């Protein structure tokens, strides 16, 4: 009866992998679980080269006939970045479910145990296939493309204000609500098998008195892309625009996102750079880095931003 | 009979295709108040700068000192209204209403929001019950505190929200409904005296994200910044590279303030990390309070206390 | 060639003044004529609080007929905000077409300063005429948002941004004259729905009873005595029932009335609980639950079949 | 000196015990969070032990009188009330109107039973005790503390059937939050409550009867008749939109008013303002939801049946 699920641990407040498994032995009634310790770091230290390797490992795991799904334990701070990277790069319809905890395993009313039990339920459910990469936490199933950590510190921090959840887990039952209307996983062009490094992309904030010199510094340190976390709908001050023009003059791809938290940065013929659609800055950086593995053609990169 | 309101125009999409053109388009405002328009500036708010917001604050302070001004409405772009409004929230030494207003659609647009926004803002500014509430941002039938309200969406009419703090009030059916008073210091109780000042200590904002680079901290230090606000991962969590950058800044006397990129909530104290914490201030609000904090002191404990009280 | 869109008007504040015919709404936003070849048809002209099942049934049947024509590519239905979620979910279950069906409404009357209706209607016509809008289920378009009829609800008495689906989000948004589609609903609707209402002229009676401290058994008695076929309970919490409500429900079940337990809370799942009477409404709110229950009772009174509809529609 | 906090237990899922991790007395709640001893000197008192869907006005009245008695004592600094989540908003708003003290009254609840994996009640209870015992918490009105949030009784509502984060005040936010063992107070409510409320229920043992009727397509007039015949003193209408009323509902309302029943138009929508409309029967609920509006109406009817006086209470409380 039971699905074969690998729990691949990377670190996080949620935390070895076998302690997490033995600490929530109820997972063993939902799936035949095998723990693998991939890494053990706080997610604020997760790096692209490690995420690239995580993607390659999960691709290897899901190519096996004896693996039905993977649960990846991770820190909450950057789970949206790791999850979106896998969303673009894992070429399987078998479920990939990131899980995390906002309270440490030792805290009163720690959320990790239930989050993990939910994540294993989701990863093992046959109805979970072909949905894109998911983040499960606090009874919710979020798409990697939409979900984001919206609050510094609360248990219900992961939300997608405009897109909602793919599903919810209540009373030990999964309720699937939406399928994302975007490309991912088995329909994505972002194959990264045997890449070993990724194009450098920095994120610069927009705000009153924002300085041009941060652009100059990024250019000088060899960035290939800049994601702008812009005022409003990717609006730019005279200083930012001077900086973006310098970047473009020097061969950098400029992507205008928003610092607001939500919503669409629309095309604008009268401003430099590309536009991020509804990708926030963290997600935009991940798609831009992957885009630059394939192309430097701004029309092609822009169309990825509208479709992924 | 009527309240005397000054409409001080700074620019923004609310005036997008003069202040008297905005007034003449909403002649209904004249039944709520005796309005006078003044054109302070005309710029998109992405170009608003501290030096200009200083002048704005000084002008509004001057106006509110006058018997013949009951309140001020400030028309502004949406993109950085939260920054301008929080600056005035900290520096305007009057209990008379100061109401920032804006529009997400240009004045020419089908179902443009500016006309009703402006009428609501004039109602709020003239209402006797509006006194002593701190600076306000009025848009889309909502009254937001300058300390909590933020532009949460790039493009929608209902973008201004304070998810955890709610609205001070709402305007429905031509009546104001006051819900909350902010439990923070502001306006007449503020220490932030900016009379005589013409510029402000330099503070930049650096983002937190996977692979964030140390060299941006170096660049900021080299350019003479007095403060760095960090728009951190999670609860102001810092990578190894960020910590290195922050330790370099602290050694050079830069005040480092850890906020969050998430959008909401509390960055709690953590003695094992560098720098101060931003309480519930988002990075744009944190920059504004940190610049004003540095007009009084560089002492980290004093600044941290401002951050827990303003 | 522009899409051919019928604008079917039913009333609402969108046509209110401080009433207006469909051609006036159209002519107040002449931009709609650049997006589509529009034909206005006045179906009704009432406030939506007065919209009734028998009329919604006729609306559905008319829209079904229209969308079977080769010269109609989609329909926009102007309606009051107050019960648009009920009309829209009814059509979502009963219109057997993939062509777009887009309800639109306005929170401010047409005469109001910064009236919302003009942009709402333009957006609605854009949505209805886009080929990418096909096969999505019935939609409610307002305030730059495209809500599924199955999830969207009026969440605020009085604001422009009242239509939200907190847990399910929007199907799409309309920004800068462009449609951004985000989600497809994972539920049955329209061309995959079993709820055929061709030929019908009336629907089984279903009332909604509220749950709250001191809630009285006598409202159950009254509904039962008046011949209701179903009772939707707008329950405390997750369809929780007081001793009085349980007494009332057991009376109803004795008389063959189908009891459906929803929630007054506004959102989320009422889970199965074999210890309590009645069926459970999944994530359907009470207004939506009533619409699905009325239609279910046209086909079955088997509680298991009804329960499965509530988990799949 | 630590504050003296009474934990007054009334039931709820916070005190629930299921078969497995996928009824309880107060001292069991207290003993599962021994950390509470460092925040306060706590004493447990068992007021009731029921599911909150069974809480009744007559018992809520007794609860308020007990809390009033407790807070009059010098040796009581604050009270925490453990309760079911389903009608906590009703009991809390009742006390918010009738507790004549500035000392903290903090309702607390839990969405998962005590036996559940990652049960929320232990931390909810600790946070409620911290809030009740903090000197900064006085004079804030009655509070509901759950999931790191401090909600005013006047605004807070259960918005979701089943999630941990269900308690929200979408338009009014939280009074405060509790993060890292520290309280952050954000707002003071701009409404009358507690020591400034006219609603004294010291002598009473019951309240005027008020029922709630829903608004929806095809809503039936006969439920108005039924209510009137069962002796209601008020009807709260959970109306369509902004308290909009069908022709059937208007006929029902008019019959109610003829019989001296006070009709209060609220909204089913979940949030926002039901504005005055002289063209419609009855009064309007301001931003009070139906459950809150019923509580205020019952208390209003202990003092007056003057619709003007009742309307003004609804704009001020
Ligand atoms: N800093 C932690 C926070 C968490 O997991 O809640 C991490 O991201 O590893
Ligand atoms: N970029 C404009 C946007 C607006 O006002 O909606 C501004 O901030 O001036
Ligand atoms: N009562 C009106 C309100 C609206 O349309 O906004 C209706 O539903 O017809
Ligand atoms: N039905 C329970 C639900 C809860 O406590 O969460 C009660 O309200 O007592």
Short mmCIF file of N, CA, C and O in Angstrom, two decimals, chain D residues 228-294:
data_model
loop_
_atom_site.label_atom_id
_atom_site.label_comp_id
_atom_site.label_asym_id
_atom_site.label_seq_id
_atom_site.Cartn_x
_atom_site.Cartn_y
_atom_site.Cartn_z
N UNK D 228 -40.70 36.05 15.75
CA UNK D 228 -41.59 36.99 16.44
C UNK D 228 -42.48 36.12 17.40
O UNK D 228 -42.61 36.42 18.57
N UNK D 229 -43.01 35.03 16.88
CA UNK D 229 -43.96 34.17 17.67
C UNK D 229 -43.28 33.51 18.88
O UNK D 229 -43.95 33.25 19.91
N UNK D 230 -41.95 33.32 18.81
CA UNK D 230 -41.16 32.77 19.91
C UNK D 230 -40.60 33.79 20.89
O UNK D 230 -39.81 33.45 21.79
N UNK D 231 -41.09 35.01 20.78
CA UNK D 231 -40.83 36.02 21.80
C UNK D 231 -39.52 36.72 21.75
O UNK D 231 -39.06 37.31 22.72
N UNK D 232 -38.94 36.79 20.55
CA UNK D 232 -37.70 37.51 20.44
C UNK D 232 -37.90 38.99 20.76
O UNK D 232 -38.95 39.55 20.46
N UNK D 233 -36.88 39.62 21.36
CA UNK D 233 -36.86 41.05 21.61
C UNK D 233 -36.07 41.80 20.51
O UNK D 233 -36.29 42.98 20.28
N UNK D 234 -35.19 41.07 19.83
CA UNK D 234 -34.40 41.60 18.71
C UNK D 234 -34.20 40.55 17.67
O UNK D 234 -34.14 39.35 17.94
N UNK D 235 -33.98 41.01 16.45
CA UNK D 235 -33.53 40.15 15.35
C UNK D 235 -32.32 40.86 14.75
O UNK D 235 -32.39 42.04 14.39
N UNK D 236 -31.22 40.12 14.70
CA UNK D 236 -30.04 40.53 13.91
C UNK D 236 -30.11 39.82 12.56
O UNK D 236 -30.28 38.60 12.48
N UNK D 237 -29.92 40.60 11.48
CA UNK D 237 -30.06 40.11 10.12
C UNK D 237 -28.61 40.03 9.53
O UNK D 237 -27.94 41.07 9.44
N UNK D 238 -28.15 38.83 9.20
CA UNK D 238 -26.84 38.65 8.54
C UNK D 238 -27.01 38.88 7.07
O UNK D 238 -27.17 37.94 6.28
N UNK D 239 -27.07 40.15 6.67
CA UNK D 239 -27.60 40.48 5.41
C UNK D 239 -26.74 40.25 4.21
O UNK D 239 -25.52 40.16 4.31
N UNK D 240 -27.34 40.28 3.06
CA UNK D 240 -26.61 40.26 1.79
C UNK D 240 -25.88 41.57 1.64
O UNK D 240 -26.46 42.61 1.89
N UNK D 241 -24.61 41.58 1.26
CA UNK D 241 -23.95 42.86 1.07
C UNK D 241 -24.05 43.77 2.30
O UNK D 241 -23.88 43.31 3.45
N UNK D 242 -24.42 45.02 2.06
CA UNK D 242 -24.39 46.04 3.13
C UNK D 242 -25.76 46.08 3.81
O UNK D 242 -26.46 47.12 3.77
N UNK D 243 -26.12 44.93 4.38
CA UNK D 243 -27.40 44.79 5.07
C UNK D 243 -28.60 44.92 4.12
O UNK D 243 -29.67 45.29 4.57
N UNK D 244 -28.43 44.55 2.83
CA UNK D 244 -29.52 44.62 1.80
C UNK D 244 -30.48 43.54 2.12
O UNK D 244 -30.12 42.43 2.64
N UNK D 245 -31.74 43.87 1.80
CA UNK D 245 -32.93 43.12 2.23
C UNK D 245 -33.87 42.85 1.03
O UNK D 245 -34.17 43.77 0.26
N UNK D 246 -34.16 41.58 0.80
CA UNK D 246 -35.18 41.21 -0.22
C UNK D 246 -36.56 41.70 0.16
O UNK D 246 -36.82 42.09 1.28
N UNK D 247 -37.47 41.63 -0.82
CA UNK D 247 -38.85 42.00 -0.53
C UNK D 247 -39.44 41.14 0.59
O UNK D 247 -40.28 41.64 1.40
N UNK D 248 -39.03 39.87 0.69
CA UNK D 248 -39.52 38.95 1.71
C UNK D 248 -38.99 39.32 3.06
O UNK D 248 -39.68 39.39 4.06
N UNK D 249 -37.71 39.63 3.11
CA UNK D 249 -37.11 40.09 4.36
C UNK D 249 -37.69 41.41 4.84
O UNK D 249 -37.86 41.60 6.04
N UNK D 250 -38.02 42.32 3.93
CA UNK D 250 -38.56 43.62 4.31
C UNK D 250 -39.96 43.35 4.95
O UNK D 250 -40.24 43.89 6.02
N UNK D 251 -40.74 42.50 4.32
CA UNK D 251 -42.06 42.21 4.87
C UNK D 251 -41.91 41.64 6.30
O UNK D 251 -42.66 42.03 7.22
N UNK D 252 -40.98 40.67 6.47
CA UNK D 252 -40.70 40.10 7.78
C UNK D 252 -40.28 41.11 8.83
O UNK D 252 -40.70 41.07 10.01
N UNK D 253 -39.33 41.98 8.46
CA UNK D 253 -38.87 43.06 9.30
C UNK D 253 -39.96 44.01 9.73
O UNK D 253 -40.03 44.40 10.90
N UNK D 254 -40.81 44.37 8.78
CA UNK D 254 -41.94 45.28 9.08
C UNK D 254 -42.87 44.62 10.09
O UNK D 254 -43.29 45.31 10.99
N UNK D 255 -43.11 43.32 10.02
CA UNK D 255 -43.96 42.59 10.98
C UNK D 255 -43.31 42.60 12.35
O UNK D 255 -43.96 42.77 13.38
N UNK D 256 -41.97 42.41 12.36
CA UNK D 256 -41.24 42.43 13.61
C UNK D 256 -41.34 43.79 14.29
O UNK D 256 -41.60 43.88 15.52
N UNK D 257 -41.12 44.88 13.55
CA UNK D 257 -41.16 46.19 14.11
C UNK D 257 -42.58 46.50 14.66
O UNK D 257 -42.70 47.15 15.69
N UNK D 258 -43.60 46.05 13.94
CA UNK D 258 -44.99 46.27 14.41
C UNK D 258 -45.19 45.68 15.78
O UNK D 258 -46.01 46.24 16.56
N UNK D 259 -44.48 44.58 16.09
CA UNK D 259 -44.59 43.94 17.38
C UNK D 259 -43.61 44.38 18.44
O UNK D 259 -43.48 43.73 19.49
N UNK D 260 -42.86 45.44 18.17
CA UNK D 260 -41.98 45.98 19.13
C UNK D 260 -40.58 45.34 19.14
O UNK D 260 -39.82 45.67 20.06
N UNK D 261 -40.31 44.46 18.16
CA UNK D 261 -38.97 43.81 18.02
C UNK D 261 -38.00 44.77 17.40
O UNK D 261 -38.38 45.45 16.50
N UNK D 262 -36.79 44.88 17.95
CA UNK D 262 -35.78 45.78 17.38
C UNK D 262 -35.06 44.97 16.31
O UNK D 262 -34.61 43.84 16.60
N UNK D 263 -34.98 45.51 15.11
CA UNK D 263 -34.33 44.84 13.94
C UNK D 263 -32.97 45.55 13.71
O UNK D 263 -32.94 46.79 13.59
N UNK D 264 -31.92 44.73 13.64
CA UNK D 264 -30.52 45.18 13.50
C UNK D 264 -29.96 44.51 12.24
O UNK D 264 -29.77 43.26 12.18
N UNK D 265 -29.65 45.33 11.24
CA UNK D 265 -29.10 44.90 9.94
C UNK D 265 -27.56 44.92 9.98
O UNK D 265 -26.91 46.00 10.05
N UNK D 266 -27.06 43.67 9.97
CA UNK D 266 -25.61 43.37 9.80
C UNK D 266 -25.38 42.75 8.41
O UNK D 266 -26.16 42.97 7.48
N UNK D 267 -24.24 42.08 8.22
CA UNK D 267 -23.84 41.55 6.94
C UNK D 267 -23.32 40.12 7.16
O UNK D 267 -22.60 39.86 8.15
N UNK D 268 -23.55 39.30 6.13
CA UNK D 268 -23.02 37.94 6.06
C UNK D 268 -21.54 37.93 5.51
O UNK D 268 -20.88 36.86 5.45
N UNK D 269 -21.10 39.09 4.98
CA UNK D 269 -19.92 39.09 4.10
C UNK D 269 -18.64 38.76 4.87
O UNK D 269 -17.72 38.10 4.35
N UNK D 270 -18.60 39.16 6.12
CA UNK D 270 -17.45 38.94 7.02
C UNK D 270 -16.80 40.21 7.55
O UNK D 270 -16.14 40.18 8.60
N UNK D 271 -16.97 41.34 6.88
CA UNK D 271 -16.20 42.54 7.22
C UNK D 271 -16.98 43.79 6.80
O UNK D 271 -17.73 43.72 5.84
N UNK D 272 -16.62 44.91 7.41
CA UNK D 272 -16.92 46.21 6.89
C UNK D 272 -18.20 46.82 7.43
O UNK D 272 -18.83 46.33 8.34
N UNK D 273 -18.53 47.94 6.84
CA UNK D 273 -19.55 48.85 7.42
C UNK D 273 -20.89 48.64 6.71
O UNK D 273 -21.03 48.70 5.48
N UNK D 274 -21.95 48.47 7.53
CA UNK D 274 -23.32 48.54 7.03
C UNK D 274 -23.71 49.97 7.33
O UNK D 274 -23.83 50.33 8.50
N UNK D 275 -23.88 50.79 6.27
CA UNK D 275 -24.17 52.19 6.40
C UNK D 275 -25.70 52.42 6.68
O UNK D 275 -26.54 51.60 6.29
N UNK D 276 -26.02 53.55 7.32
CA UNK D 276 -27.48 53.94 7.44
C UNK D 276 -28.16 54.03 6.09
O UNK D 276 -27.50 54.36 5.07
N UNK D 277 -29.47 53.69 6.07
CA UNK D 277 -30.25 53.81 4.91
C UNK D 277 -31.73 53.94 5.40
O UNK D 277 -32.35 52.95 5.69
N UNK D 278 -32.18 55.18 5.56
CA UNK D 278 -33.58 55.47 5.96
C UNK D 278 -34.64 54.79 5.05
O UNK D 278 -35.78 54.68 5.47
N UNK D 279 -34.30 54.36 3.85
CA UNK D 279 -35.28 53.70 2.99
C UNK D 279 -35.54 52.28 3.45
O UNK D 279 -36.46 51.66 2.94
N UNK D 280 -34.71 51.74 4.35
CA UNK D 280 -34.80 50.35 4.79
C UNK D 280 -35.23 50.25 6.24
O UNK D 280 -34.96 51.16 7.02
N UNK D 281 -35.88 49.13 6.60
CA UNK D 281 -36.34 48.96 7.97
C UNK D 281 -35.15 48.68 8.90
O UNK D 281 -34.09 48.19 8.45
N UNK D 282 -35.33 49.02 10.17
CA UNK D 282 -34.34 48.64 11.19
C UNK D 282 -33.17 49.54 11.29
O UNK D 282 -33.08 50.66 10.72
N UNK D 283 -32.28 49.08 12.15
CA UNK D 283 -31.07 49.77 12.46
C UNK D 283 -29.92 49.12 11.72
O UNK D 283 -30.09 48.07 11.12
N UNK D 284 -28.75 49.75 11.81
CA UNK D 284 -27.59 49.24 11.12
C UNK D 284 -26.43 48.94 12.08
O UNK D 284 -26.28 49.57 13.12
N UNK D 285 -25.61 47.96 11.71
CA UNK D 285 -24.66 47.35 12.64
C UNK D 285 -23.24 47.98 12.66
O UNK D 285 -22.37 47.46 13.34
N UNK D 286 -23.04 49.07 11.93
CA UNK D 286 -21.67 49.66 11.84
C UNK D 286 -20.75 48.52 11.33
O UNK D 286 -21.13 47.84 10.37
N UNK D 287 -19.59 48.31 11.96
CA UNK D 287 -18.72 47.23 11.57
C UNK D 287 -18.88 45.95 12.38
O UNK D 287 -18.07 45.01 12.25
N UNK D 288 -19.95 45.87 13.21
CA UNK D 288 -20.17 44.66 13.96
C UNK D 288 -20.70 43.54 13.09
O UNK D 288 -21.70 43.73 12.36
N UNK D 289 -20.07 42.37 13.17
CA UNK D 289 -20.55 41.19 12.43
C UNK D 289 -21.83 40.66 13.16
O UNK D 289 -22.19 41.17 14.25
N UNK D 290 -22.49 39.67 12.59
CA UNK D 290 -23.74 39.25 13.20
C UNK D 290 -23.61 38.74 14.62
O UNK D 290 -24.47 39.07 15.51
N UNK D 291 -22.59 37.93 14.91
CA UNK D 291 -22.42 37.34 16.26
C UNK D 291 -22.15 38.50 17.24
O UNK D 291 -22.69 38.51 18.41
N UNK D 292 -21.27 39.44 16.88
CA UNK D 292 -21.02 40.57 17.77
C UNK D 292 -22.25 41.45 17.95
O UNK D 292 -22.53 41.93 19.07
N UNK D 293 -22.97 41.68 16.85
CA UNK D 293 -24.16 42.56 16.86
C UNK D 293 -25.24 42.01 17.77
O UNK D 293 -25.89 42.77 18.51
N UNK D 294 -25.36 40.71 17.79
CA UNK D 294 -26.35 40.05 18.70
C UNK D 294 -25.99 40.33 20.16
O UNK D 294 -26.89 40.73 20.96
#
